[PDB]
Ligand binder design. Structure first.
Ligand SMILES: CNC(=O)c1c(-c2ccc(F)cc2)oc2cc(N3C(=O)OC[C@@H]3c3ccc(B(O)O)c(F)c3)c(C3CC3)cc12
Length: 550
């Protein structure tokens, strides 16, 4: 079966698209090599269509079925509730795409009668009709990257009314089920701090540890009808209200399995037979399916004492080594199984005998030292993409503020502390916008966050040590420095100087601003201040699922 069929109608934009990095008075202070940064547009949609369009063959053995049975047995302990309309409505982002039927996200959020009435009619229709394919819109994503150009990713989503109904039927399910079924393997349950601790403990729990990342080529496209039905059977194991059972079944037959694709101008672009990127179940479904296939593949490959870590389509396995030669052999078998299960890798997996050499979700584990000299482990990444996006956000206001999300999730890193914190606090100070709440994304969910709350947020997510880390590793330092040269970003020494200024300016404002200066920029001073404590973020993945929290 083909992942997609196309009519030839173009994937069209819904507004003006910029590909070239916007430049303002602030731009050069962050980034000089402007031509290396770009944003994807609909212009490249055709190239992506080619990539994501292919035939899927599936061969399912006893290992696959054994694992599924186990997953279902755990799922049968889950009790999920129906969300009311009002509850579902409040989970809708303020700037979520408006309905084709004469209302928008704010109307939904305000419980306007027109909005509520349509939502009730969509719900009723889901209960009564389990066969009619539900329409979806296909769009090209506008995302920023550094050169070496990627084609635009595609997003596929149904109407607002349907999206609210998805929440009613499935929000509690996709929030609770994955942790019950996958236990400690479910990655979205951890803060970054908890994650690092889990990965370290897992690595140490093996006598002779070996690990590898496994990245499936175009995962969404590899997801077949079988997989989506199997996901449903898992959901249906839950203790559910009968109305919820019917809705979930209906949503599966009519939306999740597949459906027609309509562009922004209202033309039929073709047909989908794979995972929709823009539904509530995208994250949960991918996670379950990846876990199922991977666990089965571990058994097929005879890997000993396998621990899986799965979130969305991202996968890492840590297990007991059999030796360098046997390990390499076992991974080829693992890969053969995954491919049979329809998920071949983009890049072939490589066994690793050092935790820090494993990359997943663009991140790796690294080490610094805290105030006492004690080794602290933390999560970092290549800062190329964060810096590219920060540059864009310096000249343009965007729906999602990546810089803020990056500061939050990567607060312990040298690059986030020295560059991102310094640069953006400087900007906020000059505009006196320290107290203004900004929108950002954490594990696919949208949050409204006041920058002044950063120190408190960071202490909770990472611990007090985030504000005093030093003696970063040479490998990490060199990666950052090399990236800075590549993008024409000033060197870290300059950022130190700027941070002193920003710190002093924050302290002069007093109050919460002073606390930001004290904790966030303590690294900038020679004579450090003594840092003391300050008086459902990580439940599930929601990427593409139109979820919001205040
Ligand atoms: C299956 N892979 C893993 O669980 C992970 C390993 C890993 C595992 C084994 C190994 F050997 C080495 C690294 O590192 C991770 C880092 C993060 N992250 C985080 O917590 O802070 C920031 C970073 C992050 C956040 C969000 C997004 B986003 O929504 O696209 C992102 F792309 C990166 C995460 C987050 C849950 C996704 C997941 C893993």
């Amino acid at each position: 079966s083909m992942s997609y069929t196309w009519t030839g109608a173009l994937i069209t934009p819904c507004a003006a698209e910029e590909s070239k990095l916007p430049i303002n008075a602030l731009s050069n202070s962050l980034l000089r090599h402007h031509n290396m940064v770009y944003a994807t547009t609909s212009r490249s949609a055709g190239q992506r269509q080619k990539k994501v369009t292919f035939d899927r063959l599936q061969v399912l053995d006893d290992h696959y079925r054994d694992v599924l049975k186990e997953m279902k047995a755990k799922a049968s302990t889950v009790k999920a509730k129906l969300l009311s309309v009002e509850e579902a409505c409040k989970l809708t982002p303020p700037h979520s795409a408006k309905s084709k039927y004469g209302y928008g996200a704010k109307d939904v959020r305000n419980l306007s009668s027109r909005a509520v009435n349509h939502i009730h009619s969509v719900w009723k229709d889901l209960l009564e009709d389990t066969v009619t394919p539900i329409d979806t819109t296909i769009m090209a994503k506008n995302e920023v990257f550094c050169v070496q150009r990627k084609p635009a990713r595609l997003i596929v989503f149904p109407d607002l009314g349907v999206r609210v109904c998805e929440k009613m039927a499935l929000y509690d399910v996709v929030s609770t089920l994955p942790q019950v079924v996958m236990g400690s393997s479910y990655g979205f349950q951890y803060s970054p701090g908890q994650r690092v601790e889990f990965l370290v403990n897992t690595w140490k729990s093996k006598k002779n540890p070996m690990g590898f990342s496994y990245d499936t080529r175009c995962f969404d496209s590899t997801v077949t009808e079988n997989d989506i039905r199997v996901e449903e059977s898992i959901y249906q194991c839950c203790d559910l209200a009968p109305e919820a059972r019917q809705a979930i079944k209906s949503l599966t037959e009519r939306l999740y399995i597949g459906g027609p694709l309509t562009n922004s101008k209202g033309q039929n672009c073709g047909y989908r037979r794979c995972r929709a990127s823009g539904v509530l179940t995208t994250s949960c479904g991918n996670t379950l399916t990846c876990y199922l296939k991977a666990s089965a593949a571990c058994r097929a490959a005879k890997l000993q004492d396998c621990t899986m870590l799965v979130n969305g389509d991202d996968l890492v396995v840590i297990c007991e080594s059999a030796g360098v030669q046997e390990d390499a052999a076992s991974l080829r078998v693992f890969t053969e199984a995954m491919t049979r299960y329809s998920a071949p890798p983009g890049d072939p997996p490589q066994p690793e005998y050092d935790l820090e050499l494993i990359t997943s979700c663009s991140s790796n584990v690294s080490v610094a030292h805290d105030a006492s000299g004690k080794r602290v482990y933390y999560l970092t990444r290549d800062p190329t993409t964060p810096l590219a996006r920060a540059a864009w956000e310096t000249a343009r206001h965007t729906p999602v503020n990546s810089w803020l999300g990056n500061i939050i999730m990567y607060a312990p890193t040298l690059w986030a502390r020295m560059i991102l914190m310094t640069h953006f606090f400087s900007i906020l100070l000059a505009q006196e916008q320290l107290e203004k709440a900004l929108d950002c994304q954490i594990y696919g969910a949208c949050y409204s966050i006041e920058p002044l709350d950063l120190p408190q947020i960071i202490e909770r997510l990472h611990g007090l040590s985030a504000f005093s880390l030093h003696s970063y590793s040479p490998g990490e330092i060199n990666r950052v420095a090399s990236c800075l040269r590549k993008l024409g970003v000033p060197p870290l020494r300059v950022w130190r100087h700027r941070a002193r200024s920003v710190r002093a300016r924050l302290l002069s404002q007093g109050g919460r601003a002073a606390t930001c200066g004290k904790y966030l920029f303590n690294w900038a001073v020679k004579t450090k201040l003594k840092l003391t404590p300050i008086p459902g973020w990580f439940v599930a993945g929601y990427s593409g699922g139109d979820i919001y929290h205040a």
